[PDB]
Enzyme design. Structure first.
Site, short mmCIF file in Angstrom:
data_model
loop_
_atom_site.label_atom_id
_atom_site.label_comp_id
_atom_site.label_asym_id
_atom_site.label_seq_id
_atom_site.Cartn_x
_atom_site.Cartn_y
_atom_site.Cartn_z
N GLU A 55 0.98 -1.22 0.02
CA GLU A 55 0.22 -0.10 0.05
C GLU A 55 0.91 1.35 0.14
OE1 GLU A 55 -2.79 0.59 -0.67
OE2 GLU A 55 -4.52 -0.88 0.41
N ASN A 97 -8.83 5.39 3.29
CA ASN A 97 -9.35 6.22 2.34
C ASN A 97 -10.39 7.27 3.19
OD1 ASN A 97 -11.26 3.51 1.85
ND2 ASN A 97 -12.41 5.60 2.15
N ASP A 102 -12.48 7.71 -7.59
CA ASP A 102 -13.82 8.23 -7.21
C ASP A 102 -13.58 9.57 -6.71
OD1 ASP A 102 -12.64 7.66 -4.57
OD2 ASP A 102 -14.53 7.04 -3.59
ZN LIG Z 1 -6.50 2.20 -1.82
#
Ligand SMILES: [Zn+2]
Ligand SMILES: [Cl-]
Ligand SMILES: [Zn+2]
Ligand SMILES: [Zn+2]
EC number: 3.2.1.17
Length: 129
Positions: free
Chosen positions: A35, A59, A48
């Protein structure tokens, strides 16, 4: 701050992630590696419009507030910037809420695609924990 592999494993253990919700430490270290490559300052914009923050790329769509994600929630009740600290307390505490949301670590797409079903023990191998 960019954590060393074993350094982060130790920090995560101290913060209570070892076997949290049944996920061994290796799962968490593996997730963080893909990540953020262990970098607490990592930020990445999502398609998005939301943004991922920190070592576990949490997020803004659901977990933190960055003031620029229309219609989003702040379920961890924290400013997203808190997830960029050299101290991983905020990220861990929020990760505990996320992993308990129902889908386990599948909440992290990278974990499902690059850690799940693999030898995650390899991520803490050699570490004096
Ligand atoms: Zn992510
Ligand atoms: Cl992926
Ligand atoms: Zn090291
Ligand atoms: Zn700590």
């Amino acid at each position: 701050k960019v954590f060393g592999r074993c350094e982060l494993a130790a920090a995560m253990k101290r913060h209570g992630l070892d076997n949290y919700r049944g996920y061994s430490l290796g799962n968490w270290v593996c997730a963080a590696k893909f990540e953020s490559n262990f970098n607490t300052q990592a930020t990445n914009r999502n398609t998005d419009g939301s943004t991922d923050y920190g070592i576990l790329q949490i997020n803004s769509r659901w977990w933190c507030n960055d003031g620029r994600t229309p219609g989003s929630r702040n379920l961890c009740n924290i400013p997203c910037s808190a997830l960029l600290s050299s101290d991983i307390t905020a990220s861990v505490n929020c990760a505990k809420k996320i992993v308990s949301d129902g889908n386990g670590m599948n909440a992290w797409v990278a974990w499902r695609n690059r850690c799940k079903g693999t030898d995650v023990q390899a991520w803490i191998r050699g570490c004096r924990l």
